[PDB]
Subunit: 225 residues, 3 copies
């Protein structure tokens, strides 16, 4: 048998699927896993034949968060002010979009990976929630769904089911159990068929405007050409 890969990459034309695959650890992200995720997305960003990525977990779950059991071992999550975030790709500003395909649980650092993605496609039976946040949760959640609901989720740490996630704008799509990956890959293929430069420029302006005045944001938008 071959050695275990905690992150598998599959490509189908211009769509790259990045898969967390740690059955025993319920897709928890340790140091080597985070490094592999960061490398997978670095490779995606630089590859001009890849248009859209999908981030998913195997084994019927997305990601249980940072690998607690690895704390104090050589496999521990790397926590530094510089370089990659503890979960891996969570500080990256990619030039192209990523869709999260969520089955089972997307919790703690796992939720943060989902917030980092552009869109979230969620199974009807999936659960999201906070359950410190140092992979962008406190930054992204209020921007994504508004301060009021963000502060609810952040303070309480409560579970959010798919119906509520959809109602509040956290889940962009809700699909039947087991279908998140397929549905996200199709949506990624649909996006890959659109005029790319224009879509990518519009995405980057919608990201860049956060924290800017109307005047400055409009200026940056106009550079789309």
């Amino acid at each position: 048998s071959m050695v275990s890969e905690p992150v598998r990459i599959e490509r189908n034309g211009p769509v790259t699927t990045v898969i967390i695959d740690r059955p025993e650890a319920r897709n928890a992200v340790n140091g080597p896993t985070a490094a592999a995720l960061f490398a997978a997305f670095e490779e995606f960003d630089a590859d001009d034949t890849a248009s859209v990525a999908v981030l998913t977990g195997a084994n019927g779950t997305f990601c249980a968060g940072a690998d607690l059991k690895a704390f104090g071992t050589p496999e521990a999550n790397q926590v530094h002010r510089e370089g990659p975030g503890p979960m891996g790709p969570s500080r990256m500003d990619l030039s192209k979009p990523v869709i999260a395909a969520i089955s089972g649980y997307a919790v703690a650092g796992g939720l943060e990976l989902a917030l980092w993605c552009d869109l979230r496609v969620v199974d009807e039976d999936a659960t999201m929630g906070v359950f410190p946040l140092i992979d962008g949760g406190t930054v992204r959640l209020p921007r994504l769904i508004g301060h009021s609901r963000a502060m609810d989720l952040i303070l309480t740490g409560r579970a959010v089911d798919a119906a509520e996630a959809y109602a509040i704008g956290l889940a962009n799509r809700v699909v039947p159990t087991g279908q998140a990956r397929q549905a996200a890959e199709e949506l990624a293929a649909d996006l890959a068929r659109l005029p790319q430069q224009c879509m990518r420029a519009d995405r980057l302006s919608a990201l860049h405007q956060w924290g800017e005045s109307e005047n400055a944001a409009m200026d940056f938008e106009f550079a789309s050409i």
Copy 2:
């Protein structure tokens, strides 16, 4: 019809895009007329609230693609009016969009520039310029995330998908949904309600709610407090 018509009823001014063959697409002259209409509104102390709407059962299909490369083409410059006309203006008084049929691409951007959106039950909104490969350069990428949050904004912006009135209302994009053919009337009723309120105070509150975007809590609170001077 001239491409933009202006009708007034006391302190409510209705600005009407009226280009039947072009489905109310906005070309260069049309954009210039919209900019002038709103300049005149902003400066007129007898006008309190404006309504932006489209004739012919639709709102605005976006920038006039067919006019590209002609004398009537949209004017695209870093300075001055935006391509769609009024899309860069910071008016001192509010504007209500009254949407029938389509408000798509640059037409959606005009609707996002308005303070409020009143939408017919059958109306359709969306970033249809996604499919044509024309960029959002009249504020859509700036205003949509602020209006309805980053998550839903990025959905609409990336996919370019159609949003019907029920979904627009559910996500906060449509502020009111009314029966087909009633958007203009309902917007004009709402505009008249707003015109009856104490004006200075409402206008100061509106300007602070706009200005706070991109500011820290402290700086935004400071700006807000200056409303006491108004």
Copy 3:
């Protein structure tokens, strides 16, 4: 006009002016500011609940007190007109709304981290009708809380929002049966007080601090939690 009740690590701050329907005048605002100063500084208090007695929350600033010694204090420095509305507390506050939370009263509810609302409660910018400006953070906080579109609706029109609509738009975080807002908020406060405190508080402060900041600067600040 302000009563403070404590139950372990949960402090309840109560506006209590029956004749004035819990309107906040100068002395009341000063008492609210002091209550929250004391809460912030008290290491044995984890979570606060802000609520009103007499079946209502707060009708706003006390208009009838204008021009009297009891008038709201309106200054660019120091406490806001409503009292605690400019404070950046180190710990969370839950609003427990019965009856009306309108005008400055709505602004106090927006200043809180969460809002628990009775099924028959009413919220709105009723100062629109009176011509009194929002100067206790409403224009700042409402668009952040629920998005610009719905904020501008409520701000321009001054219309009433019932509990169901408040819940649908993300203004009310919980809706409970009439008469239960205070109890439900105190339960929720106790739940929060049982969680690991340093972590919850740091996450809260980062989610507040990021407003107005670029992604990069906000991420930098967040990382200082660890």
